[PDB]
């Protein structure tokens, strides 16, 4: 997949599949992003509701 210069607000939609259903990723299922090629010119923006302030 090809992208135009600045890629802004690219949505990372994460779906959990559970045989019968596929639900969206929940705040209990906290996640980490890494860049396997070691590049570091990228940013990730996220909202923190008062359900993970302590998990995080």
């Amino acid at each position: 997949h090809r992208f135009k210069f600045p890629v802004t607000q690219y949505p990372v939609v994460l779906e959990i599949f559970n045989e019968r259903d596929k639900i969206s990723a929940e705040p209990p299922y906290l996640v980490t992003m890494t860049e396997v090629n070691m590049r570091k010119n990228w940013q990730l923006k996220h909202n923190e509701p008062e359900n993970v302030k302590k998990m995080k």
Partner: protein, 127 residues
Amino acid sequence: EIHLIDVPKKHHASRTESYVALPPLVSESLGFHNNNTLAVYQGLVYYLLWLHSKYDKPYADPVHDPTWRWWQHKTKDKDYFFYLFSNRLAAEGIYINMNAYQKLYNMSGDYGIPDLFFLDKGNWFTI
């Protein structure tokens, strides 16, 4: 044969208030309880009945079901607490569940015609 159907809710008919206080979980592999775990169970049951007594204050309070004022802010941390218990990282291995200690209003349990009935100003029942 004789059968009673369309019976009326025993707890509503007899006007009884019912609470639930399940024991705290333990991370011990065999599942046994220490004396300290039973002490924690004792104190939690006492505090439940203490709120039962303090709910009779004249002022309404914002939310019904007195146990609310006990949990309140802590209800936002449940996952965190549960996490520390699942990986057995939590203090003495005890787990205190919010939903374990609460007053039940509507349950579907034992049935049949209740013994006591209470009536007030023209209200009726059927059997």
